[PDB]
Design a protein that fits this description.
Chain C: Homodimer; dimerization promotes ELP1 stability and elongator complex formation. Component of the elongator complex which consists of ELP1, ELP2, ELP3, ELP4, ELP5 and ELP6. Interacts preferentially with MAP3K14/NIK followed by IKK-alpha and IKK-beta. Chain C: It is found in: Cytoplasm; Nucleus. Chain C: This is Elongator complex protein 1. This is part of a larger assembly, with 3 copies of chain A. Helix content of chain A is 65%, strand content 0%. The first copy, chain A, is elongated. Chains B and C meet through helix 7 of B and helix 1, helix 2 and helix 6 of C.
């Protein structure tokens, strides 16, 4: 499980910059869907982490935009 | 008016601004006042549609209000949605965000043949931000000189990996441009620094970096010095 | 092990910096240009070096190899734009389109 967990945290700033890249063409809705799905999965693994116990993820990864938000 | 007054009394501010917008342009000054004094233009434009100049006006207001002290790249983008290009009427990179500078230098022309002042400010910001990407079109536009770019990379000090901008004596000499001497100086300083750090015995960054930057010393004659620094890289192995 | 050490010290002929040339095994973007430029045999006018470097390193999931070498090679910038989009390098494709004035492809494929 930890393997998949670490697989999920790699795409934070990738998604972040893709959001603005899309937003020039004004795809804020699709990027908003992307952000929402990523946030839900992040919360899922975040809440499951105490359940399992074991790596520690970083809390200083930026993947959200105010216009996106 | 009447319905709008009833809206604002019960705080139907969204419905109030809807009434103002649908009741004609006589309310657009007042509507803009209400939405930007209280920073409510965001929800107004979200409710609004990109179908008039008012939409772009609200977007520019949003950008300018968000351009205050904010390195936030979409703030520069919104302030740039207008202007002579999609890069604002003014130099939105002046907000201090180097990403705005990269966008400016990365899209569209701006009436200067070389944008020389833009390149100099770009290099200055990159130095201030300790980002050694100026050794690129950044300094290949406004500092076309290969020699000057090589020098500026030397102050950037990224030659410990072979960027070889002289392409093995295309223009000038390694010793003459103080490439090997500066390499030896930095290598020996960092050499002593790692021993000093290991005296106090994280470092995994130097685990392979120098272990693959070792070549800058191997490619020279000082192969023996490799181990002479590798000891420090060896030391941390026993933690 | 025809790799970095072998070809490296071949272009070095041992501990000497550049005591030999005219031999490269794979050319991992460094020994290739070291061989080509030092003791210049074929220039990028002989663009086969650029083709080999682009193919190899792009196959190695780099996609920046072409973005650099094709600058010295022919104006195939559009292929570089395509490779950047495949590698998600957006702003570099933007630089190429706004420098070479290839504006027609601003929205045809990237969007």
């Amino acid at each position: 499980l930890s393997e998949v967990v670490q697989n999920t945290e790699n795409l934070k700033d990738e998604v972040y910059h893709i959001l603005k890249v899309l937003f020039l063409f004004e795809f804020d809705e699709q990027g908003r869907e992307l952000q929402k799905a990523f946030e839900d999965t992040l919360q899922l693994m975040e809440r499951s982490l105490p359940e399992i116990w074991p790596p520690k993820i970083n809390r200083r990864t930026q993947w959200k935009l105010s216009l996106l938000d | 008016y009447q319905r709008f007054t009833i809206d604002k009394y019960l705080k139907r501010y969204e419905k109030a601004i809807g009434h103002l917008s649908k009741c004609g342009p006589e309310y657009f000054p007042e509507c803009l006042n209400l939405i930007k004094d209280k920073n409510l233009y965001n929800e107004a434009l979200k409710l609004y549609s990109p179908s008039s100049q008012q939409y772009q006006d609200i977007s520019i207001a949003y950008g300018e209000h968000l351009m205050q002290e904010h390195m936030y790249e979409p703030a520069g983008l919104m302030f740039a949605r207008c202007g002579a290009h999609e890069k604002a009427l003014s130099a939105f990179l002046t907000c201090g965000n180097w990403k705005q500078a990269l966008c400016v230098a990365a899209q569209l022309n701006f009436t200067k043949d070389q944008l020389v002042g833009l390149g100099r400010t770009l290099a200055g910001k990159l130095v201030e931000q300790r980002k050694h990407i100026d050794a690129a079109m950044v300094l290949e536009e406004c500092a076309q000189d290969y020699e000057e770019a090589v020098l500026l990379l030397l102050e950037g000090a990224a030659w410990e990996e072979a960027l070889r901008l002289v392409y093995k004596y295309n223009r000038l000499d390694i010793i003459e441009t103080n490439v090997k001497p500066s390499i030896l100086e930095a290598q020996k300083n960092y050499m002593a620094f790692l021993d000093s750090q290991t005296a106090t015995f994280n470092t995994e960054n130097l685990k392979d970096e120098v272990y693959h930057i070792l070549k800058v010393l191997f490619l020279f004659e000082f192969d023996e010095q490799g181990r002479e620094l590798q000891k420090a890289f060896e030391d941390t192995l026993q933690l």
